Amino acid sequence: GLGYGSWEIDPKDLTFLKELGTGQFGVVKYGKWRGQYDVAIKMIKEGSMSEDEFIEEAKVMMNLSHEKLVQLYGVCTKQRPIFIITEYMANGCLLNYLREMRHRFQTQQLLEMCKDVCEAMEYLESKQFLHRDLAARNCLVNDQGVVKVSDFGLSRYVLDDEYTSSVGSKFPVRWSPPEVLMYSKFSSKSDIWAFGVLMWEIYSLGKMPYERFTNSETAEHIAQGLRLYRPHLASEKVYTIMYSCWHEKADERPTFKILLSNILDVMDEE
C-alpha cells in the first residue's frame, strides 16, 4: 500500500503525469497511485546511490512519522532504475518558492516556515536521527504553504565524490560548522548550525549565504569568526535565534527543542 501494508510498491499502480525536474539522484515525476493518491516518484540514477545501504535504512525511515517530514511511501526495486515513492509537495522546493517574489511574504509567514522546519528537526532530534544536509533546497512546500523537511539522512548514500568530500564542489560548505569542515565532526549540533543558515535563507528570501565568497574563503572565514549578517526582514529577536546556531563551540549551540521554544515565544508576541 501507500503508507500502509507492503512498502514495495507495484509500479503497475503508478501513472506518470508531470516532470518535476531533477534532484540529487536524478529525475523526479509527479504521478498518481491507483489513480487517486498524489505521489512523487524519484527515479534513482544508476551509480548515484549506495542502494543496498539505503534500502536497509529505509526500514528505519518508514518508522519515522511527523506532519512536517515528507513521508516516505515505499520503493520500487524490481526494475532499473529503482524508484522511491514519497509524499507529493505541490509547490516544490523551498529555495525556489522563497525566490518567487510574487508571493510577497509577510514576516509572520517566514517565521511559520522556520517553525515548520524546527518541529521536524525537533522530532528527528528526539529519535537521535541526524539530517546531515539541512538546507532550503532540501525542504519542500505543499499546496497549503506548509514547509516539510525532505531527504533526511540521504547524504550517507550519495556516491558522487564531489558531494562527499568536504572540499568538493558540491559539499554543503556554506551550511557547515567549523568542526565539520576542519575535522569531519558531525553531530546534532552540526544540524543546528545548518538550521541557523536555513533561517537566514528564509529571511533573505533565498539569497545564497556568503555569496561574496568562494567555498574555500567561506570555510576559512567562518572558522575565524565571520558570521552572516542580519537579513533586513529579520527582527533583532529573530536574528538572535539564527545567530545562536552559529556558536564556535558546538556544546553552546541550542537544541532543536530550545530553538522551537524560542521561535514560539516570538510568534506568541503577535
Ligand X SMILES: CN1CCN([C@@H]2CCCN(c3cnc(C(N)=O)c(Nc4ccc(C5CCNCC5)cc4)n3)C2)C1=O
Does residue 210 interact with ligand X by CB under 6 A?
Answer: no
The grid coordinates of residue 169 equal: 564542489
Q: Is 88 annotated as a binding residue?
A: yes
Q: Is there a catalytic annotation at residue 38?
A: no
Cα–Cα distance, 245 to 60 (Å, whole number): 28
Q: Is 96 in the site for ligand X (CB under 6 A)?
A: yes
| Type of residue found at 235 | S
Which of ligand X, Cl ion, none is residue 23 near (CB under 5 to 8 Å by kind)?
ligand X
- Show the site string, 139-178: x = touches ligand X by CB under 6 A, - = not: -x--------------------------------------
Min separation Cβ 172 and ligand X, Å: 14
| Partner whose binding site includes residue 231, from ligand X, Cl ion, none (CB under 5 to 8 Å by kind) | Cl ion
Q: Which of 116, 133, 151, 191 is catalytic?
A: 133
Work out which of 24, 138, 176, 204 binds Cl ion, going by CB under 5 A: 204
Report d(CA 3, CA 38) in Å as an integer: 13
Name the minimum Å distance from CB 112 to ligand X. 19
Contact of residue 232 among Cl ion, ligand X, none (CB under 5-8 Å per partner type): Cl ion
- Least separation in angstroms between residue 247's CB and ligand X is 30
Is 107 assigned to a binding site? no
Whether the CB-CB separation of 85 and 70 falls below 8 Å is answered with no
CB of 238 to Cl ion, least distance (A): 12
Given the complex with ligand X, which of 31 and 177 has the nearer CB atom? Answer: 31
| 21 scored as a contact of ligand X (CB under 6 A) | yes
Please count the other Cβ atoms lying within 10 Å of the Cβ belonging to residue 108. Answer: 9
Residue placing its CB nearer to Cl ion in the complex, 103 or 127: 103
Query: How crowded is residue 70: how many other Cβ atoms within 10 Å of its Cβ?
Result: 21
Among 69, 72, 74, 86, binds ligand X (CB under 6 A): 86
90 binds, among Cl ion, ligand X, none (CB under 5 to 8 A by kind): ligand X
If DSSP states are collapsed to H, E and C, what string results for the chain?
Answer: CCCCCCCECCHHHEEEEEEEEEECCEEEEEEEECCCEEEEEEECCCCCECHHHHHHHHHHHHCCCCCCECCEEEEECCCCCCEEEEECCCCCEHHHHHHCHHHCCCHHHHHHHHHHHHHHHHHHHHCCCCCCCCCHHHEEECCCCCEEECCCCHHHHECCHHHHCCCCCCCCHHHCCHHHHHHCCCCHHHHHHHHHHHHHHHHCCCCCCCCCCCHHHHHHHHHHCCCCCCCCCCCHHHHHHHHHCCCCCHHHCCCHHHHHHHHHHHHHCC
- Closest residue to Cl ion: CB criterion: 231
Q: Which residues are annotated as a binding site?
A: 20-28, 42, 86-89, 154
Q: Which residues are annotated as a binding site for dasatinib?
A: 86-89
Positions in the binding site for ligand X (CB under 6 A): 20-21, 23, 28, 40, 70, 86-90, 92-93, 96, 140
Q: Which residues are annotated as a binding site for ATP?
A: 20-28, 42
Positions in the binding site for Cl ion (CB under 5 A): 204, 231-232
Q: Which residues are catalytically annotated?
A: 133
